[PDB]
Amino acid sequence: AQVLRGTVTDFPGFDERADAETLRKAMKGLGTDEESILTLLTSRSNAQRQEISAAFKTLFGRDLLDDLKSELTGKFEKLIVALMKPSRLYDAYELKHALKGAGTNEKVLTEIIASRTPEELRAIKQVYEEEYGSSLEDDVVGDTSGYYQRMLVVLLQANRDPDAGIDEAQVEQDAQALFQAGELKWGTDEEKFITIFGTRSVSHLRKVFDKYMTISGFQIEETIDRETSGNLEQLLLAVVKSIRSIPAYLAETLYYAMKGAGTDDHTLIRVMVSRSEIDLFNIRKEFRKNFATSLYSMIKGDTSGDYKKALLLLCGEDD
């Protein structure tokens, strides 16, 4: 399919001492030059941002991060601070920040654990432990319940079959189980639908989604309802949608985060930063295709200020 790319890449002919001085010049004295800051950081890669941060410290004896936290304000500050976080630690940080006793944010839990590949989930599990000194499963387990928690664990095991010629018997039989499960409202034999959804391979599972509607008339997603359903049905839907296309799922997330009154700035920030160098371009295409409107335009009509200016640049084009 389309090759996978972000909207941010290495700045060619990058100078971390020159960068560091531009940034210093933009904060030194009363006031701030927010346009210099947002225009520089937005067109430097995460790796480069970290390099500048280091040149900052060596040529001025100050911490780049703190200076930005005292110079900057609001949603704008939140966006730049996110941009500066090492890409290796970003996903674990967000997981960690969501797991909070009874205040736990399941939406974030669902969204990162359902759209990340095994390779990515394994790395997040290594990093999390290193940083917060505890394993991710234990924290998930301690702050979640029911088959929701059980399915989070199966997926965290980052262990789903590799692709191979499909076994067409297994597909019909597997489409059958899921049909019945839907009928009984996803609240019986969880152990059975759970092994199917988190262990079968992506190609096998795309065949199954196909058999299911032949053998049922509607698409799996129509048996779940993304507004009222529980934790578990919400996970089931994210999983089905991410199987079909990660960029299509992240594009929908961005859409419901702006769609309406206000904006879910947290969600908009978390998806734009995190995917800027992976698939933001692809998310842009799906978005446009599926919502009949460019992402660039929705952001432009939902945000304002330097917050808006930096997000339009990360977006980096009108589709």
Nearer to Ca ion, 75 or 160 (CB): 75
Query: Is the Cα torsion angle 51, 55, 61, 64 positive or negative in sign?
Result: negative
Nearer to Ca ion, 119 or 227 (CB): 227
**How many other CB atoms sit within 10 Å of the CB of residue 7?**
20
| Closest approach of Ca ion to the CB of residue 236, in Å | 27
| Closest approach of Ca ion to the CB of residue 30, in Å | 6
Nearer to Ca ion, 23 or 273 (CB): 23
Contact 242, 209 (CB under 8 A): no
| Closest approach of Ca ion to the CB of residue 1, in Å | 31
**Alpha helices (H) in 28-117, listed in sequence order:** 34-41, 46-60, 64-71, 74-84, 87-98, 106-115
Closest CA to 82 of 253, 247, 271: 271
Number of separate helices (H) and strands (E) present in the chain: 19, 0
Q: What is the DSSP letter of 245?
A: -
Nearer to Ca ion, 133 or 260 (CB): 260
Residue numbers of the site for Ca ion (CB under 5 A)? 27, 258, 260, 263, 302
The whole-angstrom separation of Cα 272 and Cα 4 is: 15
Nearer to Ca ion, 68 or 258 (CB): 258
| Closest approach of Ca ion to the CB of residue 262, in Å | 5
| Closest approach of Ca ion to the CB of residue 271, in Å | 15
